Amino acid sequence: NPIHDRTSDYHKYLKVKQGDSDLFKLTVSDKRYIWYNPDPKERDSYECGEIVSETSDSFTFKTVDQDRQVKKDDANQRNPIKFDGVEDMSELSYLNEPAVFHNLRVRYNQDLIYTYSGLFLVAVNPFKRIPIYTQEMVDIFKGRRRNEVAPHIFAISDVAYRSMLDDRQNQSLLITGESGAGKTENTKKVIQYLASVAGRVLEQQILQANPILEAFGNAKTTRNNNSSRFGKFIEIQFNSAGFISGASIQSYLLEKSRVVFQSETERNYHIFYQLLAGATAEEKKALHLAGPESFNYLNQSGCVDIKGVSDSEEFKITRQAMDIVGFSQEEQMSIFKIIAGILHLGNIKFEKGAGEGAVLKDKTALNAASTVFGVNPSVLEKALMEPRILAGRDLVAQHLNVEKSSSSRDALVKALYGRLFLWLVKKINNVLCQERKAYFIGVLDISGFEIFKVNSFEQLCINYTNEKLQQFFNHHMFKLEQEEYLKEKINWTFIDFGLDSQATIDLIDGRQPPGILALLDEQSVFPNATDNTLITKLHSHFSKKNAKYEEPRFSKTEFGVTHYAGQVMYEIQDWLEKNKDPLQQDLELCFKDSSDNVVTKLFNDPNIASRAKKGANFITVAAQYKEQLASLMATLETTNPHFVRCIIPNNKQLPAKLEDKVVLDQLRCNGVLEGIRITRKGFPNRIIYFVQYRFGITKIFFR
Ligand SMILES: Nc1ncnc2c1ncn2[C@@H]1O[C@H](COP(=O)(O)OP(=O)(O)O)[C@@H](O)[C@H]1O
Ligand SMILES: O=C1c2ccccc2N=C2N(c3ccccc3)CC[C@@]12O
Ligand code: VO4
Ligand SMILES: [Mg+2]
Ligand SMILES: [Mg+2]
């Protein structure tokens, strides 16, 4: 038993290290301590002070430098240090902000990133490798109850799996966190663990799905070098006997705008850098490829490499993963042709002709794109600069200017890339679809809460998704929990835990009165609407009317939303075009005639290519977003949830650097302390009258 052996890797890496005789002396001390703010302007910066005296209502304590006094009602008492490193913080005597943070600090300082906070797991990103995910670690956790073993993502994965078998009920693992917190890395460990303990080719294909999805769907942002730019719900499927029988990836809207634009220091999707770094010399000749600095879509941000990442070595991994999942050699070729042709399209330079319409004087990029896509360059050229539309019923060739031609070219690119992504996921899913499931454990890995210098429509939807997920945690931990006590009349006084995202949710997606997204959609079919009339309308509805909305005084093009995780200012530029997501039909006609078998599916397969109709108009992106979100929330309601709260230590992506204010903001807005308090004060378990106690209408309830 490595569990009981102090020299095991299990002890070394997952257990608090043996304290020494000096620490023993400190542990048995009769002295008492308080967490205080040396600077009251700075509420999250705490030191420890000895309590030197008390009255009926106050403590006096030493400060690190004088003596101060504080009302006992305002005092954040330090826990007896025997609590330092505790595995489940519901056991702390004093439940307060600096004490919770301190316990996480003690564990983190020893590379103990997992800690229970009552019923849910907290995971603080190490930003370095820690050897706790080996097969040997997996074997240890196999079938062990949560209290029998150290905190670990494997442990909560096992708890769900046993609950699935024992209760014959589908489960979910909901991993929350702002961008860079560790959601995707924990998601991968859950999958790894389930595939190992419930496993028997299929298991390898489930695992190899991920490098394919990341190469194409992750990118370096200023918050995360491997940022997920699409969310996913992964259903791991099991038969009646509890063995893995398939899996299904639900992917959510991809940030397509990143293909054509990246902010300074950021990167485009990894795949672009992987192709250019890892392609053979004549893979490169045949695709007309050179270095990333040669491509407008890769040379704007100032960043082409990521610290510690070999794009060439990752390319090998992406190709191996494609082999294992079963993409043919021609399919793969076609994939890279699409990637290369996108880079070429981005190199097309429109200019003004004799009139207002654009021309193409240099056709090098156009011809290179058309060659790799297998389309006609004259046709493509005409579809870019002179697309035909209806005017009433007449067919009228437009002649677009430089800016409109360039926008149209970008539209074609984003559609190519988003449709390729959907096709990758479809292909992967068909391979993993080998049996009707009996049960599933779904793992949710969304794009996490994020704030940039410039926040756009995509950031509003990402942040709203994170808001909705926090609301789901609030509903499960506090609201449904107390509704049960009160449906069962068990002598409970209702506690207002002060966590309600409802006002922010309503602001964004309210129906009557219409919220932000409804108003966006209204403006999107209003024939003369502009981004300026859009923000005017938002201001007219919400400015000084909605407490979560701010019309800023320093800008006419931004509005503020107060999210659970902080206020975010949103830039309105391009929201109508983003929401309408137009593409010229002549571009689709051009690509429907491609000689490439993959390209042709992207344009002819209605499940990839066709867009749904809302009466007279195509479904907007906001409406697509809402359907996906509603479908997700509906699926989660069919499941028993388990929450993992990923916590980023700092905003620098560095190990061994826990920052007080960064971490405490997350513990606050995540509701971690509230969640510990409900665990303590409530009655987690109840059985119908079954053959520190409460007798309800139909049920026994216990602490
Ligand atoms: N448990 C972990 N072990 C080692 N590194 C991790 C762990 N969790 C996160 N990281 C590091 O942090 C980065 C960001 O984490 P990730 O899971 O991609 O964040 P997100 O929450 O945005 O999905 C990873 O690429 C890796 O460098
Ligand atoms: O987590 C997500 C997500 C999860 C559920 C439903 C929709 C989602 N949308 C997401 N995104 C999005 C991108 C462009 C426009 C709008 C949204 C990016 C992350 C996302 O897929
Ligand atoms: O940076 V993460 O979008 O994968 O939350
Ligand atoms: Mg991620
Ligand atoms: Mg600004």
UniProtKB/Swiss-Prot annotation:
It comes from Dictyostelium discoideum. It comes from the Eukaryota. Residues 29-80 form the Myosin N-terminal SH3-like domain. ATP binds at G177, E178, S179, G180, A181, G182, K183, T184. This is Myosin-2 heavy chain. Belongs to the TRAFAC class myosin-kinesin ATPase superfamily. Myosin family. Limited proteolysis of myosin heavy chain produces 1 light meromyosin (LMM) and 1 heavy meromyosin (HMM). HMM can be further cleaved into 2 globular subfragments (S1) and 1 rod-shaped subfragment (S2). Residues 629-651, 694-703 are annotated as: Actin-binding. Residues 84-703 form the Myosin motor domain. Dictyostelium myosin-2 has no K(2)EDTA ATPase activity, perhaps correlated with the absence of a Cys at the SH-1 position (688). Myosin-2 heavy chain is two-headed. It self-assembles into filaments. Hexamer of 2 heavy chain subunits (MHC), 2 alkali light chain subunits (MLC) and 2 regulatory light chain subunits (MLC-2). Associates with elmoA. Phosphorylation inhibits thick filament formation and reduces the actin-activated ATPase activity. Signal peptide: none annotated. The modification N6,N6-dimethyllysine is found at K128. It is found in: Cytoplasm, Cell cortex. Myosin is a protein that binds to actin and has ATPase activity that is activated by actin.
